[PDB]
Design a protein around this ligand. Structure first.
Ligand code: X10
Ligand code: X10
Ligand code: X10
Ligand code: NA
Ligand code: NA
Ligand code: ZN
Ligand code: ZN
Ligand code: ZN
Ligand code: ZN
Ligand code: ZN
Ligand code: ZN
Lengths: 519, 525, 522
């Protein structure tokens, strides 16, 4: 652990992190629907659809073990309500023991198989029922068909959206915010879904941990404090760790990564965590996250309208996903694998000491690079991280990065893009996207654009002379720093931030963990 | 008081300040017009109107105690000239003692009651007659009706516009500029106006002193040299003074103000001057001035077309007005008041050390603030200054600040905007606007916009997510740092700089002094 | 009624207008709260605050005539909910007769005195519940203190926000049914009863203005809008006159006609008149800016943020004047004569358009140098104001989406009022208070007048140097009013609800309150 430099004594010296969240105190119980539902304290919510009948009526099919509640939920009373996706109603009544109970439903539409986006809308409606209501228990009755992965995603998303991050509130903490202590779930074939519960709780926290790092502003979350947080995480999980400082980075000749950080008051810190299975290692994987804790753009300052310099604390979202994956992997302990979690962390600032547009810098593999724009800093840091990763001798290198704003014009805010030099690895990532329910789309590395990276003076240009397809150009540049290892690159610039809710998504934690686990 | 850091040895280490100005050497005398005007030397100017007759003829009403000059001034010789506001003519003639004299007039229009804008137009025409003419004496004959405040305004405005600031001239000083040594004034009921003369001279210098600080560039006028200047002023006036440095500001937890200054080579300096009357103190007042000695914008750099980064030495105009008020109050010594003159002085710069867009910082009242734009820095420094002010236990807090460029689109360059949480205090400011002749207009604090300052992570956002009425949003933000004290906020971003003349106005010195003096005097007088 | 020109046969030739709305079928009953609440039918919502406990718990005080609902409303249950402004919960349950009812609340915060903005938040929360409701009755129980004007504002806002404009949809909602009954429990119910039918009138005036504003510029053009005004006048038995191009040329309205030169739609000048049956003691002209589409002209709205896609709303001032005509023609005030005026046209790009730099002559003989074809509203108003002053009225009030600078001075909530007469300004401010449509007085600063001095024409249309554009526009308009008390209401910032993507109908209620309460009555 290194000391965080301060300008004034009021500058923070660590990222506040909540490990023991209220979600972790919730006791989860799963019951089979065949035994009927007991309707007692708290709120009991039925998830109901009506296939093929758009905005069709609500009908409750499950057996309910209360005559009063069964009478309330008969078809004649329920048919006045409809299943329109995201719609909900609350019910009040006295049960057979003369206790008042609260019941309701969330509409799940008319399409038998819900997409991750549909299921998220269902969860958001459920969370509105949890907020502003002091409940000790929620019970959820599944009258829809979900596979095991989608059941886990429901739980992960519920936990994540319910959790409210108050680390930076002082005088404006929500004085009414209370969390349930119990969650009941009724589902058909419950025994087959029970193994998903604790996996969902792990995936939730890896994702929420990533969100905590992302949302932490750049005065709290800087290269020293972020690498310190990684050390503490490794200590908690018994992972091996190494933080490389400037002197070691100079010895490794990491000139592209070091140049980006020249202008910052925070020394560069390179994170290397390692998980190794106890048994024979059958696969070795390097996960590389882009870790720019604030991106001002440098001398190519983000001053253009719409460049959103105020959100650029999120430019370490890739590092956060890799560290959240380390939480999940260190918790779940997969066998037969060795995983390296890597991030070349730095901050891109304006200073007398900053690198300049036009500088020619030398990466750790000897390639000279002409810098065309100091705001294309992520690919420079990743170049040196990829050289480092390939020296580890791994089977797969996967990097994840908020690399190019063009991602918003190609895939938008819902799907990440994956690029790579190896179809088998790309297909493994796409399969992990399916089982994590974090959507990714394969995009091409178009070799015809490579000539636009030819530099008159250096071995290569950082940016293209003509091509505006920057996500593809960036991938061509990165490809030059992986010589003979299967490699894939996930550009999460469009999917990292939830603009409607003004908070991170923690995108990539579950994708990467499913990738490690399914291998 | 503190050493000014330098990058090279040629960097200045103090603000040059002229205290003993040529205006202070002018001997002023007021005579009653009923005794007639003696026309002996120099230039004699008649202020003449023609009520109800647009561009009507010049006719001189005064008795003139010279037969030759009286003959020149006959209606018949004056009829080719008219009273159009701001027009002037010069006359040359020999008086009864066979000495050559210069006589003329400035037209005051056809509307009996002159506004501040009209009176300034009259003064500017008079000043053109003083420039490029080596005169030892000016005499002004009021053939128009002015009340006591407008007469004082005439002199203050004359003194201020006549004064030429040459502190930064080296090889291009004006070799021909000579100041008059005598000013004569003829007016009806002269005895009632005589007390306005030395009041005008005090108000002139408070305003010119503020102008000197504003016009001083940011290499001369930085947080250290500006606070050093305030100490020197306090010492000359026998005011109590305290300059708070970074270590004391850290102990007071002023994280909003300190964050703005992080990127500067100049340490933050918080100015606290105090005037206290001898005897019973009936009212305690805090005047808070925005003191950004240069506003680059920070990482939200002022790079957009029209952002005027080259004029941002003027972002301490609020502090300048407060220090000019301290000069006037410390000179005039009102009774029954205790006045605190406050400014959280710093510089908003780009550096490896600067605060960043998105940072969450903690104000001295414990409120966490999400920074949405480093160029909304003034309201961050004022938030901590207002917390400091309220801890003094005052009856009124009035802040004055070049806060929002939106003022140019609401009131423009003539009228300042006042916002506040207390109708009585707002009305006192409006009354002070009337008697100082510095115009201000009351604008609302619209509470419906407060929710757009709600932050997802911090207690409050610095800037709004959707509202473009930035002067109102900034006021809503400042209101969060005043808990239970009458408070008003004067946004002078639009009125501080005279774009036509390329110089400061020193706006607010006379407004704030009139505010203090009118409060020091019981309403029964 | 003039024929609407078409480019293709699919171009619409009228504005669709709904007069009979579901709101008009709601039977409203007001009951005194001191007698307890009948809750056996429909949806019952309690308006609840908690002074002295910020976001504190909900507590319901009223006695209710149903044992099941009384148990739901026990303190132990409602303390699970909080009063944060706009927060709501509602539950369905069976009453003592085993009939389905729904009961809930809207939180009204912790400050006893609600502003109009707070009351809008409460109403929006209520309307969200209504747009998912099929019970035939809503009952609202005021356990908060509201004055008579604010209670009327509650009803108007409830009606306006509840109503959904479906004129341009090709289908029709499976999720709600409009209520047939509205019950209100409030203290002093007898004094609030007279506000109900006034609110219903004010609602439709605002909704009518909203329909004209929201109607797109292919539906709402100078011909179809003046045709709609004629139809309204006929239904209300107002006198009406539409001036066409030949009459406008005879009246020498060169400023207004220049703006419309580039349009395929002929200019149409709307003049409706309400005259009281008794002696006329006061004459008022209401002048609304009626640009049915503002492209900017050759000064095209191409800059970032210029919002050319929303510029069907540049006739919001005309819409407010016509909605006021509906309210005045319906309430029939005494002793007044009201002229409702709008110089209607469209600002387009064409070989026939006026150009930046053109010098045009207004109907009072003043020549104007055009500095920007997108400052077209003040040109149309100049001629409208000359026409208005020739009517010999006591007051001229104009209302207009005139200057974008309003968004930077007062924003989206308060309109600005300017004028040449302090008494008339104070009357407008009082109408703002009793209509609950907020306005703030801004100055006409005479020092800026010299920037309208033109080198060649009598006056410049715009300033080259002064950025206080709302004040400069007021100085320009003031030159077309010679000797009559005049006020100018700039609604450019408040007229469109950006969050809800719909008009506000701002100004109908303000102007009607001015006309109803202008003349003191003893
Ligand atoms: O890609 C570029 C330059 N071309 C470009 C920029 C913006 C839009 C289209 C093209 N610059 C990147 C950078 O600075 N990398 O270091 C960058 C810039 C922006 C975002 C981002 C993230 C978000 F969440 C957004 F919503 C968003 F609009 C943009 C990510 C990376
Ligand atoms: O208000 C903003 C937001 N931008 C903005 C918007 C609309 C118009 C102008 C600026 N930024 C302020 C700031 O940077 N505060 O620190 C600021 C900026 C400019 C002036 C100023 C002073 C003058 F004397 C002027 F003549 C003038 F045009 C502007 C004052 C404060
Ligand atoms: O005033 C100007 C000069 N430009 C300008 C100056 C300062 C700031 C912004 C624009 N242009 C006007 C125009 O072109 N009139 O014809 C105009 C422009 C926009 C809106 C408007 C209406 C709305 F309903 C809004 F919601 C809104 F945000 C803006 C009204 C008038
Ligand atoms: Na962060
Ligand atoms: Na329309
Ligand atoms: Zn970046
Ligand atoms: Zn960048
Ligand atoms: Zn600024
Ligand atoms: Zn500033
Ligand atoms: Zn326009
Ligand atoms: Zn317009």
């Amino acid at each position: 652990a290194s000391e965080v430099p301060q300008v004034v004594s009021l500058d923070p010296t660590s990222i506040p992190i909540e490990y023991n969240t209220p979600i972790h105190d919730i006791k989860v119980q799963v019951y089979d629907i065949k035994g009927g539902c007991n309707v007692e304290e708290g709120l009991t919510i039925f998830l109901v659809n009506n296939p093929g009948k758009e905005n069709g009526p609500v009908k409750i099919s499950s057996k309910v073990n209360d005559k009063q509640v069964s009478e309330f939920l008969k078809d004649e009373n329920m048919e006045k309500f409809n299943v329109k996706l995201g719609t909900s109603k609350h019910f009040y009544m006295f049960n057979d023991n003369k206790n008042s109970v609260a019941v309701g439903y969330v509409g799940c539409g008319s399409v038998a198989d819900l997409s991750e986006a549909d299921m998220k809308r269902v969860v958001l409606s459920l969370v509105t029922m949890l907020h502003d209501n002091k409940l000790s228990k929620l019970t959820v009755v599944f009258e829809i068909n979900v596979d095991k992965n989608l059941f886990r995603f429901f739980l992960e998303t519920l936990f994540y959206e319910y959790m409210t991050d108050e680390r930076f509130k002082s005088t404006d903490k929500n004085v009414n915010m209370e969390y349930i202590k119990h969650l009941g779930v009724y589902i058909n074939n419950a025994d087959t879904y029970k193994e998903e519960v604790e996996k969902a709780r792990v995936y939730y926290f890896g994702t929420y941990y990533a969100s905590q790092l992302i949302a932490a502003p750049s005065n709290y979350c800087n290269p020293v404090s972020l690498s310190n947080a990684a050390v503490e995480l490794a200590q908690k999980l018994n992972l091996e760790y190494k933080i490389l400082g400037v002197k070691e980075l100079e010895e490794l000749k990491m000139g592209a990564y070091l140049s980006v950080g020249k202008g910052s008051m925070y020394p560069n810190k390179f994170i290397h965590l390692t998980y190794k299975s106890k048994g024979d290692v059958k696969k070795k994987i390097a996960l590389v996250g882009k870790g720019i804790t604030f991106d001002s753009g440098g001398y190519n300052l983000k001053a253009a309208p719409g460049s959103m310099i105020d959100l650029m604390k999120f430019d370490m979202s890739g590092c956060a996903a890799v560290l959240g994956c380390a939480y999940c992997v260190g918790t779940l302990k997969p066998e037969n694998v060795e995983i390296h979690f890597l991030s070349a962390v730095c901050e891109n600032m304006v200073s007398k000491n900053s690198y300049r547009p036009g500088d020619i810098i030398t990466a750790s593999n000897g390639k000279t690079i002409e810098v065309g724009n100091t705001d294309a800093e992520g690919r420079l840091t990743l170049a040196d991280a990829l050289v480092y990763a390939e020296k580890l001798g791994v089977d797969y290198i996967v990097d994840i990065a908020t690399l190019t704003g063009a991602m918003l014009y190609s895939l938008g805010t819902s799907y990440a893009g994956v690029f790579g030099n190896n179809e088998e690895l790309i297909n493994k990532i796409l399969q992990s996207s399916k089982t994590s329910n974090e959507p990714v789309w394969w995009l091409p590395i178009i070799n015809e654009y490579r000539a636009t990276l030819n530099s008159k003076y250096a071995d290569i240009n950082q940016i293209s002379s003509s091509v505006k397809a920057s996500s593809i150009v960036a991938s061509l540049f990165l490809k030059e720093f992986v010589q003979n290892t299967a490699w894939a690159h996930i550009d999460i610039a469009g999917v990292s931030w939830n603009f409607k809710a003004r908070k991170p998504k923690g995108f990539g934690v579950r994708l990467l963990t499913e990738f490690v686990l399914n291998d």
